[PDB]
Tab-separated table of C-alpha atoms and ligand atoms in Angstrom:
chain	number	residue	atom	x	y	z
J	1	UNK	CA	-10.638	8.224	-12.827
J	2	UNK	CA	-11.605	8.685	-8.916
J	3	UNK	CA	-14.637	7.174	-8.387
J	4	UNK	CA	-16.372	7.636	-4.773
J	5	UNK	CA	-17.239	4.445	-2.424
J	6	UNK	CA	-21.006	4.224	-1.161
J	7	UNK	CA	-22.083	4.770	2.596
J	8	UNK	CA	-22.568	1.086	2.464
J	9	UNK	CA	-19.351	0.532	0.297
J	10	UNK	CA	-17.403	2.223	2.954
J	11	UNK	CA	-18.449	0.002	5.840
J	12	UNK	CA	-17.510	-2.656	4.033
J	13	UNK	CA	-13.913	-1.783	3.368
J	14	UNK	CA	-13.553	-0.756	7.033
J	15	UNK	CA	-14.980	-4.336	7.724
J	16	UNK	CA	-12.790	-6.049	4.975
J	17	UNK	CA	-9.861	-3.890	6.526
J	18	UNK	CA	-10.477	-4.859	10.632
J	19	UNK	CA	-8.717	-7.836	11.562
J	20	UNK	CA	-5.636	-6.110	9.504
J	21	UNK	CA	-6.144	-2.930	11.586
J	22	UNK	CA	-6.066	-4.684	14.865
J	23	UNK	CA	-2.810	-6.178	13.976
J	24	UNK	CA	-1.734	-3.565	11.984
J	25	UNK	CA	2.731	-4.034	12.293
J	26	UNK	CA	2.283	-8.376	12.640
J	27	UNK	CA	0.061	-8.235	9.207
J	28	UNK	CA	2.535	-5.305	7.555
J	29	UNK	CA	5.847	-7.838	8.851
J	30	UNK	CA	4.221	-10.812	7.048
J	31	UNK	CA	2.805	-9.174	4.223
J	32	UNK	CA	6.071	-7.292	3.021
J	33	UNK	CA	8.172	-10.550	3.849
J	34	UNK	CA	5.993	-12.370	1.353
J	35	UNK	CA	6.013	-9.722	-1.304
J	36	UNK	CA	10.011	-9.534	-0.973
J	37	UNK	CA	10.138	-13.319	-1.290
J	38	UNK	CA	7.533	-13.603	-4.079
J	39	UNK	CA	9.475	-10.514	-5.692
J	40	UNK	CA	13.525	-10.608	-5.068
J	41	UNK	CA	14.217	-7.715	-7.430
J	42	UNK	CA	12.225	-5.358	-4.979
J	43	UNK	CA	14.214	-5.641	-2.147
J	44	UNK	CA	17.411	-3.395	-3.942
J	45	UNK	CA	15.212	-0.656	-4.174
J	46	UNK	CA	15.095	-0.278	-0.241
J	47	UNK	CA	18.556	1.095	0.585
J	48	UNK	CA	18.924	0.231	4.084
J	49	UNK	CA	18.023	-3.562	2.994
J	50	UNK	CA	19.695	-3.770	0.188
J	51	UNK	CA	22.695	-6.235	-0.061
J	52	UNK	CA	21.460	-8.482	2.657
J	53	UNK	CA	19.858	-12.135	2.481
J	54	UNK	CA	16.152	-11.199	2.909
J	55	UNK	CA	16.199	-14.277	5.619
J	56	UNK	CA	18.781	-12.004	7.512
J	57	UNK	CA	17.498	-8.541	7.266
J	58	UNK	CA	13.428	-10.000	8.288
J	59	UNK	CA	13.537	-9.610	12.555
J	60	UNK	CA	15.475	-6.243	11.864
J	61	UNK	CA	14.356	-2.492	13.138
J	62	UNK	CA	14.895	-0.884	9.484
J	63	UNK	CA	12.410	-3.590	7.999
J	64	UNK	CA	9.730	-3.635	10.208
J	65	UNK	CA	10.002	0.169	9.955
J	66	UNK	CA	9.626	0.175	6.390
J	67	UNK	CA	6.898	-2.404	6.195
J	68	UNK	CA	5.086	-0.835	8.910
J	69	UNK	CA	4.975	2.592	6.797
J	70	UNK	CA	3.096	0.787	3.738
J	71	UNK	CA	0.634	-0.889	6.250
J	72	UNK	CA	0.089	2.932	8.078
J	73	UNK	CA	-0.573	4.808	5.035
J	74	UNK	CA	-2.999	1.805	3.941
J	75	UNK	CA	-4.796	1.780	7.579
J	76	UNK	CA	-5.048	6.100	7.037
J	77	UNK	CA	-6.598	5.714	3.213
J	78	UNK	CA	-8.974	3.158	5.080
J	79	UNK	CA	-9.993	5.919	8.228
J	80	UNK	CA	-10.223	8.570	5.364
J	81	UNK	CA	-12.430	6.036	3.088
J	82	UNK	CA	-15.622	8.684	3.371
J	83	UNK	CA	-13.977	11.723	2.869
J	84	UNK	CA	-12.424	11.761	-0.867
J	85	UNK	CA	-10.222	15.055	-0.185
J	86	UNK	CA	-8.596	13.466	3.163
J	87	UNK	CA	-8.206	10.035	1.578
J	88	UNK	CA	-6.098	12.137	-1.702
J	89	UNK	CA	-4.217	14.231	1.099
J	90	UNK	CA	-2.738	10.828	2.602
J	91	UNK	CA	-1.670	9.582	-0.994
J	92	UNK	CA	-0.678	12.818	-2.024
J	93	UNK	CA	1.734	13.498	0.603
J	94	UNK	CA	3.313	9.757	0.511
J	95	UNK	CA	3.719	10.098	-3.388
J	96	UNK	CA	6.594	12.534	-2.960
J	97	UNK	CA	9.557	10.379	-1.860
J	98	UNK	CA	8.601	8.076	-4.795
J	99	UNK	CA	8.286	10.263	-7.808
J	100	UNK	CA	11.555	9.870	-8.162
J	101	UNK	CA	12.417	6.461	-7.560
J	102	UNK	CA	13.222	3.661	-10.046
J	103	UNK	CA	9.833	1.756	-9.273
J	104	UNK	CA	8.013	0.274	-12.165
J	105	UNK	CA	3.947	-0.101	-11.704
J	106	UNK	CA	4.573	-3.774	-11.763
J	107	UNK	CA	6.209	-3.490	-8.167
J	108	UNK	CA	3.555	-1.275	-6.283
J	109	UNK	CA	0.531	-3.707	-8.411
J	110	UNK	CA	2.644	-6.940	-7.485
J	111	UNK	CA	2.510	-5.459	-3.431
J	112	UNK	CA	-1.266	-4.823	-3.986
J	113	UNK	CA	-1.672	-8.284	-4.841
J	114	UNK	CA	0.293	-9.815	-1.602
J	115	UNK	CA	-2.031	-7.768	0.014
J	116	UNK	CA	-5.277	-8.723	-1.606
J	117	UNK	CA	-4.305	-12.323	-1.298
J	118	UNK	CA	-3.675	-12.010	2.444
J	119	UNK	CA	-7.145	-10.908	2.775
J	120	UNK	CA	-9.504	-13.625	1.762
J	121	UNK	CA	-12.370	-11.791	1.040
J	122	UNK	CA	-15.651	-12.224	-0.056
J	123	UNK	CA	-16.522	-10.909	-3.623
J	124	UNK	CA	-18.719	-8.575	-1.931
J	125	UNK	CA	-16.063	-7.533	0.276
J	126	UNK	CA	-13.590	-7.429	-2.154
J	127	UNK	CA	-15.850	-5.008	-5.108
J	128	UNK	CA	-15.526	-2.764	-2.360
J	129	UNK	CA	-11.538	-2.826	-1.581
J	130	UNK	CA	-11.110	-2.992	-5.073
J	131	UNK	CA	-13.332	0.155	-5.233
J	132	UNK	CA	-10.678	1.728	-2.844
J	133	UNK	CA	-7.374	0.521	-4.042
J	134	UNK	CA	-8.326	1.572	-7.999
J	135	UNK	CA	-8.948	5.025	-6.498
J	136	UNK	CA	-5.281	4.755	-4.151
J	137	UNK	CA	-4.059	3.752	-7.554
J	138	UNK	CA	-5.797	6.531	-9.630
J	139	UNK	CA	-4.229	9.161	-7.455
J	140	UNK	CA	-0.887	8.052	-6.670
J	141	UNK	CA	0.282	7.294	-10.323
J	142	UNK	CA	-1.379	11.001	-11.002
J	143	UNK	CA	0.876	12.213	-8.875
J	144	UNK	CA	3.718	10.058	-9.885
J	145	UNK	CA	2.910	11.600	-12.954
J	146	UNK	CA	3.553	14.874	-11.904
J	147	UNK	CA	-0.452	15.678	-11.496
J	148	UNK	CA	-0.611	15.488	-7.801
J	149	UNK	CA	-2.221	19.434	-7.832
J	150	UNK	CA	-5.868	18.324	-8.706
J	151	UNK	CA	-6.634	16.746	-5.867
J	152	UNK	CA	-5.389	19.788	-3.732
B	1	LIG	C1	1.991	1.086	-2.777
B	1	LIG	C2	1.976	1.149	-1.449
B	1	LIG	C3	3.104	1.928	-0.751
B	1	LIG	C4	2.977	2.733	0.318
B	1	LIG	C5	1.703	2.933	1.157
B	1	LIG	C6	4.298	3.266	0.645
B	1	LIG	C7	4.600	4.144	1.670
B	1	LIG	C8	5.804	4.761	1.908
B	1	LIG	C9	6.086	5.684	3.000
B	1	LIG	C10	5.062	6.142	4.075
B	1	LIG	C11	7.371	6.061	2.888
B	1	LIG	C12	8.157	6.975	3.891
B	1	LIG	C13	8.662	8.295	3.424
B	1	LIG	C14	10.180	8.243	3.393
B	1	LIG	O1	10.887	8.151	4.444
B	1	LIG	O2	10.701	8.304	2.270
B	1	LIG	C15	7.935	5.382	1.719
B	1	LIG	C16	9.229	5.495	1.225
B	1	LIG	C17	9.824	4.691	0.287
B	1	LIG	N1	9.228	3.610	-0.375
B	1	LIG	FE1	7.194	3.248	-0.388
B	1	LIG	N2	5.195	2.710	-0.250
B	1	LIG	C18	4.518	1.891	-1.124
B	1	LIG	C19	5.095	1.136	-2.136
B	1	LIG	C20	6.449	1.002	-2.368
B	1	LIG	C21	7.107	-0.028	-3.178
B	1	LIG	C22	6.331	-1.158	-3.910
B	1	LIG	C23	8.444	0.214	-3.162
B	1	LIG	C24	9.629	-0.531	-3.842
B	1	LIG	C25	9.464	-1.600	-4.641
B	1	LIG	C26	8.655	1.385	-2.328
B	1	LIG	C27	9.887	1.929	-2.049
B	1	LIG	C28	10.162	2.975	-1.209
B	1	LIG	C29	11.409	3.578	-0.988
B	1	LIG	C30	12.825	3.145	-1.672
B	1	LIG	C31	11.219	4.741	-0.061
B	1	LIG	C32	12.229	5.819	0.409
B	1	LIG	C33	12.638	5.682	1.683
B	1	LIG	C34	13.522	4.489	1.538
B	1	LIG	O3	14.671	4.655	1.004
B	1	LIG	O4	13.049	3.394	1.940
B	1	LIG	N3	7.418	1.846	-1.876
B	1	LIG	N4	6.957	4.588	1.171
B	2	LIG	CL1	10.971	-9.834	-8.988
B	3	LIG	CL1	17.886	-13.340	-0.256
B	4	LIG	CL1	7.809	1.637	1.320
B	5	LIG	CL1	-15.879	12.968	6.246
B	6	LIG	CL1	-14.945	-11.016	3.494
């Protein structure tokens, strides 16, 4: 279920989130590289990359593009952390290209966890991102689902 972040909860995301924020594309380059290399059978499901070495298809416009998209929608859910309506809105209007995509919940959890990883927090620190990311998770797969409406 959605379950709201504190005042203090919220700080700490933002805080947990900053030095990603103020590097938002370098982070989002490295971070989807990694995932794609941890995870080879991911990269097929992004048509513009697909069929390339990974190596080859890295310093390219359509990648950075693509990994820059994740990192945006990440850096919005983290502006709209207070406001449980706006933070739904920015999940609810990505979920649409994927609801019908061949993506297992393996893939998107496996991309959570490059991203957690990359982080290094603090246990305090990371209760709250956790906090956040269950919710991201909570709504998207609801609308994945085909419940996206309730959050309207
Ligand atoms: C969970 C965090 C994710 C976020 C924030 C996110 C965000 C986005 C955004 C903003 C778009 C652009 C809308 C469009 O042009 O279609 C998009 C499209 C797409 N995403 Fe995601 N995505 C996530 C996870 C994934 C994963 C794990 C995969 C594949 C393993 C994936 C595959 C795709 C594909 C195939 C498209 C369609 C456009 C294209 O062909 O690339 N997404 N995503
Ligand atoms: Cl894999
Ligand atoms: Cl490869
Ligand atoms: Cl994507
Ligand atoms: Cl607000
Ligand atoms: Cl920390």
């Amino acid at each position: 279920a959605f379950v709201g972040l504190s005042d203090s909860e919220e700080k700490l995301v933002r805080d947990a989130w900053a030095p990603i924020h103020g590097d938002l594309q370098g982070t989002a380059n490295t971070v989807f590289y990694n995932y794609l290399k941890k995870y080879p059978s991911n990269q097929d499901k992004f048509e513009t990359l697909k069929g390339h070495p990974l190596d080859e298809v890295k310093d390219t416009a359509n990648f950075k593009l693509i990994a820059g998209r994740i990192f945006t929608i990440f850096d919005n859910c983290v502006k709209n952390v207070g406001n449980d309506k706006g933070f739904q809105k920015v999940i609810a209007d990505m979920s649409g290209p994927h609801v019908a995509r061949p993506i297992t919940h393996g893939s998107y959890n496996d991309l959570r966890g490059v991203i957690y990883d990359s982080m290094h927090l603090d246990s305090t620190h990371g209760a709250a991102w956790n906090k956040m990311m269950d919710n991201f998770f909570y709504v998207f797969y609801e609308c994945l689902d085909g419940r996206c409406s309730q959050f309207s």
